[PDB]
Amino acid sequence: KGITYDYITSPVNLYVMNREDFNNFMDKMSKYPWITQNFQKIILIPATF
Amino acid sequence: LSPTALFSKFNDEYNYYKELRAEYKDLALQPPTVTSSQMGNAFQIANSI
């Protein structure tokens, strides 16, 4: 769905998670390869923003 | 019969004022930056400019 963040909207969905939880989430989703293949871009944005 | 001191009374602003002339005319105060963000116009929308 369209998030419309910062006045700019696009179909893609944005999620945020801490560094520690990301690997655990990856392990949990290892069963689903097609969803993982669908991930588009991963960026390490600073927390302050 | 006047001496060479006559020529001393001469004034030469000609060379000074040719010196003062500007070598380069500046269209803009500082050179314009040329870098296009990958997102594109997106950034300007963030600040509503």
| Chain B contact probe: residue of A3, A4, A7 with most B CBs at under 10 A | A7
How many Å apart are CA A25 and CA A22, to the nearest integer?
A: 5
- Amino acid making up residue A31: K
Using CA of residue B47, residue B49, residue B45, residue B43, what is the dihedral sign? Answer: negative
Decide if A8 contacts B45 (C-beta within 8 A). yes
Interface of B with A (CB under 8 A): 42, 45-46, 48
CA distance A7 to chain B (A): 7
User: Can you give the resolution of this entry in Å?
Assistant: 3.9
The answer to whether A3 touches A13, Cβ cutoff 8 Å, is yes
Strand spans (E) along chain B: none
Contact A18, A45 (CB under 8 A): no
End-to-end CA distance of chain B: 78
Residue type at A14 in one-letter notation: L
Write down the experimental method used for this entry: cryo-EM
Spatial distance between the Cα atoms of B28 and A28, rounded to a whole number of angstroms: 58
C-to-N gaps above 2.5 Å in chain A, after residues: none
User: What is the token pair recorded at B3?
Assistant: 């001496």
Q: How far apart, in whole angstroms, are the C-alpha atoms of residue A27 and residue A14?
A: 20
Three-class secondary structure of residue A8 per DSSP:
strand
Q: How far is A37 from chain B (nearest CA, A)?
A: 23
